[PDB]
């Protein structure tokens, strides 16, 4: 019902190698378009999608300078956060950043976010008012006070309502055949007997976009979400996704179960049933 322009930062160190590694990726809905890895010889901001390929000379020259300097402040920030928690200098720690903006029908900004995480746990996060932060720890208060006195929330509120919305609108228009595409999944139910009285029904859903899909098993109308074994959505490789949902049923009762698929690429939800 909306669209998303999301960026992901990752900086982590290790013993011996000293100098940490910075990786930045950007996604428009479920398709990425930009890359920056500091392990390259001369790291540039490299495109990943065919619609950002054109653009203009400064867009790559400035975002390279933006990402290269972002790689520097986060290798210093890694030691700063470690010192806040007062940890040994020989270990290996990680810092992740996730900021973006969700836009609705006619450019409506529904929600803007900008959160950080240290060693996988939530560290600092911008509130939904986009004017102040929330801190998880007391060591994170050192970052909160530093970002409060610098007024970085007013800066953050200006990006999420301005450049984040326009660039997502620019991406959606230029990659219309790729982003606004709604490919429905090809579905089928396989049947694997597993024991003397049990068989496994696997409800497949292949080659669909976007990623959001619902796979539900039902036994004569009764929902079996607790009894099902759902698998995580996996990328097929060529911009689409795959998914399947398993369920162990008694042998001979396969006709009493139904798989229900819901996806925006299908005008109506599907209800499948196994056929020998």
């Amino acid at each position: 019902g909306f669209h998303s322009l999301r960026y992901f930062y990752t900086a982590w160190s290790r013993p011996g190698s000293g100098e940490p590694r910075f990786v930045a990726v950007g996604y428009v809905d479920d398709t990425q378009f930009v890359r920056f890895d500091s392990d390259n010889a001369s790291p540039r901001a490299e495109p990943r999608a065919p619609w950002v390929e054109q653009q203009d000379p400064q867009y790559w020259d400035r975002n390279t300078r933006n990402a290269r300097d972002a790689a520097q402040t986060y290798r210093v920030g890694l030691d700063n956060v470690r010192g806040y928690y007062n940890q040994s200098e020989a270990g290996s720690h990680t810092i992740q950043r996730m900021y973006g903006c969700d836009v609705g029908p006619h450019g409506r900004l529904l929600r803007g976010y900008d959160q950080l995480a240290y060693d996988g746990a939530d560290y600092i996060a911008l509130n939904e008012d986009l004017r102040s932060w929330t801190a998880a720890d007391l060591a994170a208060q050192n970052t909160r006070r530093k970002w409060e006195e610098a007024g970085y929330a007013e800066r953050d509120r200006a990006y999420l309502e301005g450049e984040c919305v326009e660039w997502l609108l620019k991406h959606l228009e230029n990659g219309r055949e790729t982003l606004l595409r709604a490919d429905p999944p090809k579905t089928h139910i396989t049947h694997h007997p597993i024991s003397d009285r049990e068989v496994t029904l696997r409800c497949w859903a292949l080659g669909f976009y976007p990623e959001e899909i619902t796979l539900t098993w039902q036994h004569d109308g009764e929902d079996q979400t607790q009894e099902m074994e759902l698998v995580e959505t996996r990328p097929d490789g060529n911009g689409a996704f795959q998914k399947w949902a398993a369920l162990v049923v008694p042998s001979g009762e396969e006709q009493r179960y139904t798989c229900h698929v819901q996806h925006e690429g299908l005008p109506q939800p599907l209800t499948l049933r196994w056929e020998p």
Binding site: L116, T143, K146, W147, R155, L160
Partner: peptide, 8 residues
Amino acid sequence: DFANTFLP
């Protein structure tokens, strides 16, 4: 277009 990178 990346945003302003704030230093923790």
